[PDB]
Ligand binder design. Structure first.
Ligand SMILES: [Mg+2]
Ligand SMILES: [Mg+2]
Ligand SMILES: [Mg+2]
Ligand SMILES: [Mg+2]
Ligand SMILES: [Mg+2]
Ligand SMILES: [Mg+2]
Ligand SMILES: [Mg+2]
Ligand SMILES: [Mg+2]
Ligand SMILES: [Mg+2]
Ligand SMILES: [Mg+2]
Ligand SMILES: [Mg+2]
Ligand SMILES: [Mg+2]
Ligand SMILES: [Mg+2]
Ligand SMILES: [Mg+2]
Ligand SMILES: [Mg+2]
Ligand SMILES: [Mg+2]
Ligand SMILES: [Mg+2]
Ligand SMILES: [Mg+2]
Ligand SMILES: [Mg+2]
Ligand SMILES: [Mg+2]
Ligand SMILES: [Mg+2]
Ligand SMILES: [Mg+2]
Ligand SMILES: [Mg+2]
Ligand SMILES: [Mg+2]
Ligand SMILES: [Mg+2]
Ligand SMILES: [Mg+2]
Ligand SMILES: [Mg+2]
Ligand SMILES: [Mg+2]
Ligand SMILES: [Mg+2]
Ligand SMILES: [Mg+2]
Ligand SMILES: [Mg+2]
Ligand SMILES: [Mg+2]
Ligand SMILES: [Mg+2]
Ligand SMILES: [Mg+2]
Ligand SMILES: [Mg+2]
Ligand SMILES: [Mg+2]
Ligand SMILES: [Mg+2]
Ligand SMILES: [Mg+2]
Ligand SMILES: [Mg+2]
Ligand SMILES: [Mg+2]
Ligand SMILES: [Mg+2]
Ligand SMILES: [Mg+2]
Ligand SMILES: [Mg+2]
Ligand SMILES: [Mg+2]
Ligand SMILES: [Mg+2]
Ligand SMILES: [Mg+2]
Ligand SMILES: [Mg+2]
Ligand SMILES: [Mg+2]
Ligand SMILES: [Mg+2]
Ligand SMILES: [Mg+2]
Ligand SMILES: [Mg+2]
Ligand SMILES: [Mg+2]
Ligand SMILES: [Mg+2]
Ligand SMILES: [Mg+2]
Ligand SMILES: [Mg+2]
Ligand SMILES: [Mg+2]
Ligand SMILES: [Mg+2]
Ligand SMILES: [Mg+2]
Ligand SMILES: [Mg+2]
Ligand SMILES: [Mg+2]
Ligand SMILES: [Mg+2]
Ligand SMILES: [Mg+2]
Ligand SMILES: [Mg+2]
Ligand SMILES: [Mg+2]
Ligand SMILES: [Mg+2]
Ligand SMILES: [Mg+2]
Ligand SMILES: [Mg+2]
Ligand SMILES: [Mg+2]
Ligand SMILES: [Mg+2]
Ligand SMILES: [Mg+2]
Ligand SMILES: [Mg+2]
Ligand SMILES: [Mg+2]
Lengths: 205, 127, 260
RNA sequence: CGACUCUUAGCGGUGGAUCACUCGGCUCGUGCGUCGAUGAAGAACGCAGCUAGCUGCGAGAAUUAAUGUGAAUUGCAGGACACAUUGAUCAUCGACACUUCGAACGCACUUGCGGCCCCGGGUUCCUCCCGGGGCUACGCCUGUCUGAGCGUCGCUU
RNA sequence: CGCGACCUCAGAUCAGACGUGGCGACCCGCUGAAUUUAAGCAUAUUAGUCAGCGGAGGAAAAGAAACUAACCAGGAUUCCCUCAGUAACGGCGAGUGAACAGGGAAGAGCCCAGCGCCGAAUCCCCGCCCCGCGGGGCGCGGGACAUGUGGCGUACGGAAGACCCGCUCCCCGGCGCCGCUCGUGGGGGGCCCAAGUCCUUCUGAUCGAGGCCCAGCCCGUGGACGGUGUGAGGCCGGUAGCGGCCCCCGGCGCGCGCCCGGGUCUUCCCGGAGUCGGGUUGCUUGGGAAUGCAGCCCAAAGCGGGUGGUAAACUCCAUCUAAGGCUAAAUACCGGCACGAGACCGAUAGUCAACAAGUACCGUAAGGGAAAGUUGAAAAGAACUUUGAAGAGAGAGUUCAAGAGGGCGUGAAACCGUUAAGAGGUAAACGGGUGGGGUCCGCGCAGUCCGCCCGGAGGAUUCAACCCGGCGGCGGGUCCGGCCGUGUCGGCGGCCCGGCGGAUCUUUCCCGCCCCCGGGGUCGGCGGGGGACCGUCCCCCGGACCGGCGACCGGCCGCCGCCGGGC
RNA sequence: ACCCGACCCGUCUUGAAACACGGACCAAGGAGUCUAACACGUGCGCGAGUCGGGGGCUCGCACGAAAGCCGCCGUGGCGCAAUGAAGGUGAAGGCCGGCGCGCUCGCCGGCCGAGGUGGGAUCCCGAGGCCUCUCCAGUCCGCCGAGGGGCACCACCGGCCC
RNA sequence: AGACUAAUCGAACCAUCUAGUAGCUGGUUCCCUCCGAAGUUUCCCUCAGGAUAGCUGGCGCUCUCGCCCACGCAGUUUUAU
RNA sequence: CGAGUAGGAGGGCCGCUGCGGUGAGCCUUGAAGCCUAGGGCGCGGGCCCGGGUGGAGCCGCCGCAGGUGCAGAUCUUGGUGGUAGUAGCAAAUAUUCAAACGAGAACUUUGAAGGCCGAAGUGGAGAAGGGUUCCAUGUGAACAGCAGUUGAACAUGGGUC
């Protein structure tokens, strides 16, 4: 079968694929199902925003993506506890709750507490009975719009650094190096044996 | 132009609903316009038709000022039979030729309780 | 087809009988028994490569080329030679592109349409469409396509405020929003230069929405108007200019046919 | 000469091509998304004034009551032709019925053969009296009733 | 002997409930080949698929981590784009083939045993009443369930108990209505624009032409169909947050049923076994020194257990909490109930089935499974006269037509019938070449040129010039008379009464914060505003080119058509 | 009618009028398709960039199952960077001087910054003469020996990364 | 006797998988203009087939001839060897 | 300068069918088809024109899309021939004369003669299976392999205790 110069092609068509093929001609219909599903979700609720649970702020776990940031799933129980509010109180406020999430980094941890202080500043709620506890006055006709768009706070807003200008100094262009990667990379590979070779040097005696 | 999404602009579906209509739907397709002096009194454009309506034919080979009486209304063939509309067979016996009542002008009606009540509902809604 | 091109079941006789080697259905009595079964060349056989629903129907086109096509098709609709060459009646019309007021887009009744188009001298085009509403040629009359009707003008507008109700059932007209343009409406069939009525806010939104070469398009992403192949394109005025016809050789017009 | 054979052409006949029409298929997409021990799907037979198929219904059998529509059904007779009497025809369907077999349910399946309980008649309770109706499958769930155990005990002759 | 208790049990046409069966497109649990491909053929591939078997629903399954990770770490499932034809597998051949990231759709999370506390505080049935209709429930007495342990607080995110602190009055279904409901809640019924206007074709007309400088009438109704053919107005429907009639359901309010929550500290409480794991043996997976399942044997622990991708120790650390349970979404649908659309097929096509099709009929049966649409506008389906007994015909009639006469539209070709013409010994036929005849066709038959120009003959019209009248048009230079064009620039003009952007800046400017010894401190760092700067583009006087498709007057010779003069 | 020419078409085949095969005769049906993937070629759009292909926004308007938009939707795909089994590393030289025994020898300071040779379309400089008395003078057209900086690309040398 | 087992037997019948596979036979539907071959090499469980070269076609590209001597090429001679 | 199988390219105002565009195209005053000793055009694919039939839709040009072009496959299905008024209607001994009804008699009915099955029957009755075939009347287009005035045919009506 093969011939003059061409690439080896191995397609996966020995398996009788024509019985099992999903065809996307139902693609405009579901798209109109789903706008009319979100808009049916829009006019049920009330003043509360669609996509209304607020999400936390989470850095992306790898070496590849950890220089960007992402709306996670739920505020940490210990994050949310620094704001001081109880668990199932908080979901009625409209905050997402996640028990699985730790907090190793207080720069991460306090950044979400600032976000909850933001949202609880942001919040205009309504009571059942106007006994005036954590409630709102006649407030900007339900604050000028009932519903928000794509999260309440624009969760990405990925923060950039300027560090605008500086003079270059002595002893940085004198000392820094390529080689202080290579010296340190080779330092890490030999920490085990350099510990042991000197340990059996003094164990010899 | 059709702006309902739930109505037929199909040729085959409309002919199917035509020739397989129920009888009480079949009353309204065989509707006939009234004479324009009589429509001034009633304020109605056309009427469903019945057994004793005096009728002026307008189209056919039998045209113009022949106001007789109707006798049968075959719903099954979408065809009425009028008194005056004749034609002989071969064997000396007369028979009645039928005309579809899109081609018929009603000059006299039959007046009864339920014929008035339609006519009020027709005349009010034209408004 | 998908299935039941051949619901039937058959095997072939083969050698010792004089017929052929098409499969023949199994049984007797019913006089299809013994006939030719599936394949191309038989009664009640399947077709050749029974057509499949997963053919490549839809075609994807680059977003700059689509916008290139709208930019070109709008450009044809500003020359009277091209737009009469499509077939429209502009012989007594008002000057090309023709901006009617933004007061138009709040009309209610449709006598207000007819009184408009007879005063703008566009009514001659509609009266062609009345003369051209003949019946289909072919078999399309069975499959719901029965009226052939040639197009007329199209009113390009923004801020729909009643014009779509008043201009709706004019015969052969396409009532078309500015910021949602089609190539299938502006140049139907692929022959450019449809006669088009622009509105005031329509014809003033085009400066914003496509931009000059000098500024950007302040209503889209990163679309300047696409740069040109020639700038000054009068072929005759170039070739009669003093620069060229100083520089040329000479003309040469003798014929010098076959010498016997 | 005719006879015959062949070639065309007009006209006739065999046959049903082409063309035109379409109450039909396939394909896509939408909204719903519901069957049966209160006896299903399926099968059998029956039923119309004239009726065999198709459809429709089930001894109330070409459907009844009601609701809606308001005057026909139709190949032919006939009838209430009424409709300020309760109203012809169709459509809908929310009332009533649904014969035989089928998980099919008394036992079998040969319309065979029974067993109780009750009413009608008739030897005025019965005895295998005729008609009429109900009940009478299996598996199992909790509850109830009857009673078996040198299972384990008490109290005890 | 005799009774009584309980446990194991059986009996019933006992009281009352329940399962069985069907359709099976999509889903779920097991079982499972082979043709095919490797150019042969076993492993492999076909494929954990077709067929077999069992279960269910409008979805199912899955699911709130014995997870991914390996660094600034994520954080239930399901689905889509990518990772990817990639790591891996494999006579390392043919081939097979994941996942975590990342971006989307959708987002909803919880309970129980154990641990003890509350006197079984709980439950089912019966009895008797309560209650309002459409029907099912809440308050009293007895009989069981039940300590081999119902119920309340309780779940690994900790929780409980006792202090003390802080404040707190809630929530729940019915019920009766006033009111609204994203195309404007769902269902069905009846209804709503405008010509048959004149003339005219035709068997019939829905054609063909026309209606006052306001274009004949209606248009939120020109989609489609019917009606002797091609219809916005002749009829049904179409248009519309149009109109009313009935039926149903989801959004505010008189009475029931229920109610201590939040913080810190002290005290103690804190878990799932023949299961995990290990051995092996089959099968499966990309999973390889064994991914998962399963049989057999061996069989657990508590600082434990599983994992962390090459077997095996010695570790350090990361991370999760197994052997109990439930849960909408987005996802799937070639069966079923309605429905609209088609660059589809138009009867030998399309389903096998446009039709009395899963039917006629074959096979005992499992099963197999065809053909067959077309009169006309309307039946007006040929009365009567006349041969034969009738079939069959000649006259007659109906129809625009019987050259549409009951498989009846058009009715080809094969083949056959007769009439006309022509020919006939090397089977017919064919190519080249003329010929003869026939056929219609064309000309008008020797009688065929057309229009141009001038010099001649005969009647009528009005020029040209040449000026004046007046319109329109083309053609030129000063930039002329303005604009605008194209640019070097000046004002930096709008800079905060500007448009866009800028990893240009600015602790000499605020604020949410981190710092040093209640505050200031400039010692550095985070983030939102502000405003100089540019870099383009919205202005104002000036020059530098240009009058270039950018349009107007001025004026110029010369064209021009109409008036009036003049042969 | 006649002269001359004249074996029956498809098929395999070294060869068919073949004593080779299929073909009684007419009508209709009837056979390189579609999806994926790769490769070269070509048209078009953009250009160190490109791509909405999956989603969202538009009012729900017949054709709309269309089209239009996003850009703090550019995640990603393919490309810009390679090589090694892997740890990993990852593409600038040339000119004028200086320091050491200025050597099989490396370093120090400026100045442009992708080497060189042969070929090489096109372009530029062109001596030189060419057009009615003669001088005397600038534009000018065309020819132009020879010379010059040299594209694409090929052949070869040097260098740089692993 | 390899018989008979529903006119079927040295493995029945029916339907599916199945349009199984085939290097092997047969067919492969409009005209015109241009260009126009091979049965050979090597290897293959290769010998009725492919792979590869050879042969063929197409699409381009880079140049030169248009004005006493060109550049280049060859199934040819000549002159040397 | 022209050859051409296998083959590859190019041009097609060649044809068929469907879709946007255009032809102020076309037509009940006759569209499609189909036939045609009718007139032509093109090298050719194929077309235009006249006449005759029929009676309701159809074609050009620019683009787009094909399930798109037949002489062949022991082609599939349909249809008709030459063979052809030919083979053939030959198993088991057999008919004849007259008469009636009837358009019509080698066969139907009656009557007489000549016959054969010859009691293991060409007879009298059933089980199986067939399901109205039984009986009667009526017709003579089918069917009964000639014919029919007949029937186990068609049509109507009966009968199975
Ligand atoms: Mg090959
Ligand atoms: Mg397969
Ligand atoms: Mg349809
Ligand atoms: Mg099948
Ligand atoms: Mg078929
Ligand atoms: Mg046609
Ligand atoms: Mg003769
Ligand atoms: Mg004929
Ligand atoms: Mg037929
Ligand atoms: Mg009733
Ligand atoms: Mg009883
Ligand atoms: Mg093979
Ligand atoms: Mg497998
Ligand atoms: Mg299966
Ligand atoms: Mg079941
Ligand atoms: Mg269900
Ligand atoms: Mg679900
Ligand atoms: Mg679960
Ligand atoms: Mg890839
Ligand atoms: Mg596999
Ligand atoms: Mg119509
Ligand atoms: Mg109409
Ligand atoms: Mg109307
Ligand atoms: Mg495997
Ligand atoms: Mg542990
Ligand atoms: Mg352990
Ligand atoms: Mg380890
Ligand atoms: Mg847990
Ligand atoms: Mg679990
Ligand atoms: Mg047909
Ligand atoms: Mg069929
Ligand atoms: Mg008819
Ligand atoms: Mg007679
Ligand atoms: Mg006729
Ligand atoms: Mg006919
Ligand atoms: Mg006819
Ligand atoms: Mg007709
Ligand atoms: Mg041959
Ligand atoms: Mg032979
Ligand atoms: Mg042969
Ligand atoms: Mg033969
Ligand atoms: Mg054909
Ligand atoms: Mg390309
Ligand atoms: Mg990216
Ligand atoms: Mg033997
Ligand atoms: Mg046998
Ligand atoms: Mg054998
Ligand atoms: Mg095949
Ligand atoms: Mg199949
Ligand atoms: Mg086969
Ligand atoms: Mg050649
Ligand atoms: Mg070989
Ligand atoms: Mg061969
Ligand atoms: Mg070549
Ligand atoms: Mg040639
Ligand atoms: Mg044509
Ligand atoms: Mg044509
Ligand atoms: Mg097609
Ligand atoms: Mg085909
Ligand atoms: Mg051929
Ligand atoms: Mg053949
Ligand atoms: Mg024959
Ligand atoms: Mg004979
Ligand atoms: Mg003989
Ligand atoms: Mg006699
Ligand atoms: Mg007689
Ligand atoms: Mg004898
Ligand atoms: Mg006998
Ligand atoms: Mg008899
Ligand atoms: Mg008789
Ligand atoms: Mg006979
Ligand atoms: Mg009979």
């Amino acid at each position: 079968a093969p011939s003059r110069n061409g690439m080896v092609l191995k397609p996966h068509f020995h398996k009788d694929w024509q019985r099992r093929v999903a065809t996307w001609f139902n693609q405009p219909a579901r798209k109109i199902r789903r706008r009319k599903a979100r808009q049916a979700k829009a006019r049920r609720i009330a003043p509360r925003p669609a996509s209304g649970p607020i999400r936390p702020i989470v850095r992306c776990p790898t070496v590849r993506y950890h220089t960007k940031v992402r709306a996670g799933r739920g505020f940490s129980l210990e994050e949310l506890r620094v704001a001081g509010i109880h668990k199932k109180v908080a979901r009625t406020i409209g905050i997402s709750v996640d028990p699985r999430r730790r907090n190793k980094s207080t720069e991460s941890l306090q950044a979400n507490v600032q976000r909850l202080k933001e949202y609880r500043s942001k919040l205009i709620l309504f009571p059942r009975k106007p006994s005036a506890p954590k409630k709102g006055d006649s407030s900007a006709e339900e604050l000028k719009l009932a519903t928000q768009l794509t999260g309440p706070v624009m969760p990405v807003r990925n923060v950039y650094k300027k560090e605008k200008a500086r003079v270059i100094t002595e002893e940085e262009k004198n000392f820094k190096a390529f080689a202080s990667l290579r010296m340190a990379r080779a330092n890490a590979r030999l920490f085990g044996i350099r510990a042991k070779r000197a340990k059996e040097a003094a164990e010899q005696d | 132009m059709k702006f309902n999404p739930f109505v037929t602009s199909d040729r085959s579906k409309n002919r199917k609903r035509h020739f397989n209509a129920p009888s009480h739907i079949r009353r309204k397709i065989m509707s006939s316009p009234l004479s324009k002096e009589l429509r001034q009194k009633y304020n109605v454009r056309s009427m469903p038709i019945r057994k004793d309506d005096e009728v002026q034919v307008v189209r056919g080979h039998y045209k113009g000022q022949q106001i007789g009486k109707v006798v049968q209304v075959y719903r099954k063939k979408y065809v009425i039979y009028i008194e005056r509309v004749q034609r002989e067979k071969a064997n000396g016996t007369t028979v009645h030729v039928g005309i579809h009542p899109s081609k018929v002008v009603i000059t006299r009606l039959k007046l009864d309780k339920d014929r008035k009540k339609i006519l009020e509902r027709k005349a009010k809604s034209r408004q | 087809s998908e299935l039941a091109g051949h619901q039937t079941s058959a095997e072939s006789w083969g050698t010792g009988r004089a017929v052929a080697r098409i499969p023949r259905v199994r049984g007797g009595g019913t006089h299809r028994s013994g006939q030719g079964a599936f394949g191309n060349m038989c009664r009640g056989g399947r077709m050749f490569a029974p057509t499949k629903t997963w053919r490549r129907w839809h075609r994807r086109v680059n977003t700059t080329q689509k916008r290139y096509a709208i930019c070109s098709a709008l450009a044809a609709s500003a020359l009277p030679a091209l737009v009469m060459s499509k077939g429209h009646r502009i012989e007594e019309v008002p000057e090309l592109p023709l901006v009617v007021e933004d007061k138009v887009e709040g009309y209610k009744k449709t006598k207000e349409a007819v009184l408009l188009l007879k005063k703008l001298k566009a009514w001659n085009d509609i009266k062609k469409v009345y003369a051209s509403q003949r019946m289909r040629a072919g078999k399309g009359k069975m499959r719901n396509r029965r009226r052939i009707q040639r197009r007329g003008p199209c009113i390009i507008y923004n801020e729909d405020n009643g014009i779509i109700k008043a201009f709706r059932n004019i015969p052969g007209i396409t009532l078309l929003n500015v910021s949602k343009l089609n190539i299938l409406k502006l140049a139907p069939g692929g022959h450019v230069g449809r006669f088009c009525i622009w509105t005031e806010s329509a014809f003033r939104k085009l400066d914003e929405l496509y931009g000059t070469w000098r500024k950007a398009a302040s209503l889209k992403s990163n679309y300047n108007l696409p740069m040109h192949k020639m700038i000054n394109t009068d072929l005759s005025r170039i070739l009669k200019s003093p620069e060229i016809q100083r520089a040329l050789r000479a003309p040469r017009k003798k014929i010098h046919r076959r010498v016997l």
